[PDB]
Swiss-Prot record:
Location of the Bromo domain: 1-106
Consequence when changing N82A: Abolished binding to histone H4 acetylated at 'Lys-12' (H4K12ac)
Recorded family membership: Belongs to the BET family.
The protein's role, per its UniProt record: Chromatin reader protein that specifically recognizes and binds histone H4 acetylated at 'Lys-5' and 'Lys-12' (H4K5ac and H4K12ac, respectively), thereby controlling gene expression and remodeling chromatin structures. Recruits transcription factors and coactivators to target gene sites, and activates RNA polymerase II machinery for transcriptional elongation.
Mutagenesis or variant effect for V29A: Abolished binding to histone H4 acetylated at 'Lys-12' (H4K12ac)
Disulfide-bond pairs as recorded: none
Subcellular localization(s) per the UniProt record: Nucleus; Chromosome
Domain notes: The first bromo domain specifically recognizes histone H4 acetylated at 'Lys-12' (H4K12ac). It also specifically binds histone H4 acetyl-methylated at 'Lys-5' and 'Lys-12' (H4K5acme and H4K12acme, respectively). The second bromo domain recognizes and binds histone H4 acetylated at 'Lys-5' and 'Lys-12' (H4K5ac and H4K12ac, respectively).
Residues of the full protein shown: 348 to 455 of 801
UniProt-recorded name of the protein: Bromodomain-containing protein 2
Amino acid sequence: EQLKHCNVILKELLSKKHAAYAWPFYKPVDASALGLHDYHDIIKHPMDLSTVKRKMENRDYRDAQEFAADVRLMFSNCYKYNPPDHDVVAMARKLQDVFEFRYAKMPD
């Protein structure tokens, strides 16, 4: 089971080592509530960790490829939105490296 393996990676992100970057990307972006019209115009497809959790819980992602694709989109959205130069962007890059390393071992 590949799904099982993916669950292990999620636990680590929420565990502690990678929690620093987990809580920031955990919450979504309520453009409607907050007020970010430009966020919906440029991005149009806001994705957050909170939403990803719901998918795994409902088994929306019956595959690893689907999960990886969702993560890549979230990382690319932040980069497009905000240029590299803040702590936020740097936080994503740090996670990207870790994901890559784990993706190598993913394949069964």
